[PDB]
Design a protein around this ligand. Structure first.
Ligand code: ZN
Ligand code: ZN
Ligand code: ZN
Ligand code: ZN
Ligand code: ZN
Ligand code: ZN
Length: 170
DNA sequence: CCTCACTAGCGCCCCCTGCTGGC
DNA sequence: GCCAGCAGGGGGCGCTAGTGAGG
């Protein structure tokens, strides 16, 4: 009906094509009055003000005081209350509570390592791992833990925990 | 018919927390 | 003990199909 002169994508109304072309290029007309961001549509600008400026969180959790801006988050929050596991893995028996978390799990079966350190060019599976690598291996005078019993230095908190559970038996 | 708003809904990515197990 | 893999509970954005309201 209304195709895109850049890709084969098609839409039914003109406003959709107008927004689709406003994504191929940076032409975000809905500008935020309280910060320096902009968006192609209004709905994208609405929530940006409710995330950062007005903190308007409509979706409430009936079990706790949690509140989310989008319903997608609450549906995910409530899963940890009921233990749901809707997203099943196709290659193993792991199930998730968030479609993107399942995408991260697949890096176990594929061996993919997208993130690499910008200093030593060492690669990792998760963006948090890399951030830790830079802290422990490329930062100067980093604070380190200390066992108050045996007087041994440990750099990571988790290592101190397992030190107490193994050597000192909690 | 045609706009333009509002609402659900998928997707993307990152954070921080905390553990495991090879070296 | 160091190191990287790896799962939980979260925040903020990219983009679009569905509904009506008013030209
Ligand atoms: Zn296109
Ligand atoms: Zn803003
Ligand atoms: Zn809750
Ligand atoms: Zn799997
Ligand atoms: Zn490095
Ligand atoms: Zn000790």
């Amino acid at each position: 009906t209304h195709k895109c002169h850049l890709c084969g994508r098609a839409f039914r109304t003109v406003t959709l094509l107008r927004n689709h072309l406003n994504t191929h290029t940076g032409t975000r007309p809905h500008k935020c009055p309280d910060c320096d961001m902009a968006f192609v549509t209004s709905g994208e600008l609405v929530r940006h003000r409710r995330y950062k400026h007005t903190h308007e969180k409509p979706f409430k959790c009936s079990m706790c005081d949690y509140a989310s801006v989008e319903v997608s988050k609450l549906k995910r929050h409530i899963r940890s209350h009921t233990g749901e596991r809707p997203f099943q893995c196709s290659l193993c028996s792991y199930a998730s509570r968030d479609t993107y978390k399942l995408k991260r799990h697949m890096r176990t079966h594929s061996g993919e390592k997208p993130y690499e350190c910008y200093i030593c060019h060492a690669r990792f599976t998760q963006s948090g791992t890399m951030k830790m690598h830079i802290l422990q291996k490329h930062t100067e005078n980093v604070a380190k833990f200390h066992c108050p019993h045996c007087d041994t230095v440990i750099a990571r908190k988790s290592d101190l925990g397992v030190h107490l559970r193994k050597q000192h038996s909690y």
